[PDB]
Amino acid sequence: DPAKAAFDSLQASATEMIGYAWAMVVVIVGATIGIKLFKKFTSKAS
Amino acid sequence: DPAKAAFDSLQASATEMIGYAWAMVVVIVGATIGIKLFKKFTSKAS
Amino acid sequence: DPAKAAFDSLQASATEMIGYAWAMVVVIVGATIGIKLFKKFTSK
Amino acid sequence: DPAKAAFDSLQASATEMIGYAWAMVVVIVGATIGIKLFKKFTSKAS
Amino acid sequence: DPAKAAFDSLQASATEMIGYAWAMVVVIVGATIGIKLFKKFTSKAS
Amino acid sequence: DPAKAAFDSLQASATEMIGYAWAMVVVIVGATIGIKLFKKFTSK
Amino acid sequence: DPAKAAFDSLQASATEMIGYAWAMVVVIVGATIGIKLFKKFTSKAS
Amino acid sequence: DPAKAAFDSLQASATEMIGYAWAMVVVIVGATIGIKLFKKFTSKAS
Amino acid sequence: DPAKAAFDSLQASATEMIGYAWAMVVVIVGATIGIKLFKKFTSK
Amino acid sequence: DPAKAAFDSLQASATEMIGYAWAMVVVIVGATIGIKLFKKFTSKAS
Amino acid sequence: DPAKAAFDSLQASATEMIGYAWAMVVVIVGATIGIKLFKKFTSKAS
Amino acid sequence: DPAKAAFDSLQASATEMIGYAWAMVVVIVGATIGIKLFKKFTSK
Amino acid sequence: DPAKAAFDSLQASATEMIGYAWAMVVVIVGATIGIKLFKKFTSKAS
Amino acid sequence: DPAKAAFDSLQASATEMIGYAWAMVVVIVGATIGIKLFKKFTSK
Amino acid sequence: DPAKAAFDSLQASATEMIGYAWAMVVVIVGATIGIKLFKKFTSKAS
């Protein structure tokens, strides 16, 4: 079944890409939450 | 009937391919709706 | 049903995330109420 | 009428999917409203 | 006229199919505009 | 008219939802006005 | 002119649909403005 | 020239159709930009 | 120009709507200024 | 060059449309800024 | 070579057309990014 | 470069608009600071 | 390899366009940040 | 992996930008806290 | 086998082209996600 092998390869590659993607989100989401909290607390203090 | 035999083989093959395709959809849609929900909830709870 | 299986997975995942969120909100709301008390005690 | 049976099957499947979908919305909308009210009341109190 | 007969049959068949198609549209559009209105009103009243 | 039937259904559904909403807003506005009174009575 | 009659029919149908649509907007826009004003006045009062 | 005659007829027919099409555009675009402006101004004045 | 005719219609319609809006804003702004005065007269 | 004349005509028409469009923007943008300033000043006064 | 001659003519013609097309792009893109910037800055300065 | 010419035009246009905007903001900020002073002088 | 030269040309052109684009962003982003800070400080002062 | 190389470049770039941002926020927050102190010292 | 030889050449050529194409993607996607992140972070830190 030429098809089975090919479909299998594509799924493998896709899984790898999702891995790299999860990494990037954490870096950006981290930064954004960081900046927000600093600004919020500072304003409440004075 | 040389045609019955042929038509049956092609349907069998098609069914196999739809199986492989459903698998790939659940990997990709999973990822997409996992990045979306992360981005939403983090912001709403911070 | 190849769809039932998928829909069930995504609900499971969602439930897990709401749990982590209910945690984060209690840490941040704590802080905010704590800045607001101390400032009050200090300024008439 | 080959067509009638086929159209009927597709509608059946569609109805089922809408069912699964309504379930998911309730879980997410519940959470979102919950977090909002907590934050609102807390701020008004002090 | 062997052609009149044929053209009439194909129009009849077409009319039947548009009936089945209108049905499916009202099920799907219903669902979509029911999820949208839920999401809007809940947020505006909370 | 296969469209008239459909448009009528969606209006009916909308009317039902606005009813449920007018309920929820009176429960929440009640709470908010009740926190604001008690805090006032307490702090000059 | 087969075309003229057909173009005429399509415009007629379109006009009818716009009518049904204007009705729906009024019901939703009414509700939204209603909820907004109630919330605004209540907050200003106390 | 049997061709001049033919080409002239087809251009005449085309011109007629563009007339009917311009009419339909002004009915539909009208409606769309009437629902948009209603939704905008009502919200901005309330 | 089948476009000039159309563009003119849409401007006419827009002008009408701005008129209705300038009305609604004076009714709502009135109310808001009226709640703010009465509350003041009542609380130091 | 049949093409040159045709390209020229299309540009001419396009320029005219941009003219009509600039007019409409001024009417709408005027209104929006107007309503905003009235609301802002009123709130600051009392 | 009767073919060299022909291929050369068609390239010449193509070059002419890309000139007319670049012109049209600068008129339309100009307008679009002029309406966008107007709408942005006016709102941010009012 | 048929693109260089175009990009240059759009930057020129943008610069002109920022100029008109820096004007409008000084007229509006003036007004806002002027309402806030007068109200203060009037109410303890 | 006719292809290699062609792919190379396209990349060269693309790089140039990105250059022109970075310039425009700086002019607009500069302005926007400027207007924001002025408004913010003024409000905090009085 | 022609994708690994690309994903790595974009993360590197992102890290650089977050650095520049943490700078800008400390300059602006400084200013805001400095306007709020001086105004207070001046008005009861 | 005169066909083996031919099929092998065409695969070789294809592989070369996918190399050139991957290169172009990393230049363009780079630029796009560099303009986006600039616009986001500047606004959130000002």
From Swiss-Prot, chains A, B, D, E, G, H, J, K, M, O:
So where does this one cross the membrane? 18-38
**Family under the similarity heading:** Belongs to the inovirus capsid protein family.
- Main function: Self assembles to form a helical capsid wrapping up the viral genomic DNA. The capsid displays a filamentous structure with a length of 760-1950 nm and a width of 6-8 nm. The virion assembly and budding take place at the host inner membrane.
> Is the keyword Electron transport in the record?
no
The record's keywords, sorted A to Z, are: Capsid protein, Helical capsid protein, Host membrane, Membrane, Signal, Transmembrane, Transmembrane helix, Virion
Q: How does it sit in the membrane?
A: Single-pass type I membrane protein
Which residue ranges are assigned to the Periplasmic compartment in the record's topology? 1-17
* Cytoplasmic face residues: 39-46
User: Subunit comment for this entry?
Assistant: Homomultimerizes. There are several thousands of this protein in the phage capsid.
Q: What is this protein called?
A: Capsid protein G8P
Where does it sit, as one GO cellular component term?
Answer: membrane
Compartments, record wording: Virion; Host membrane
Predominant location of this chain? virion
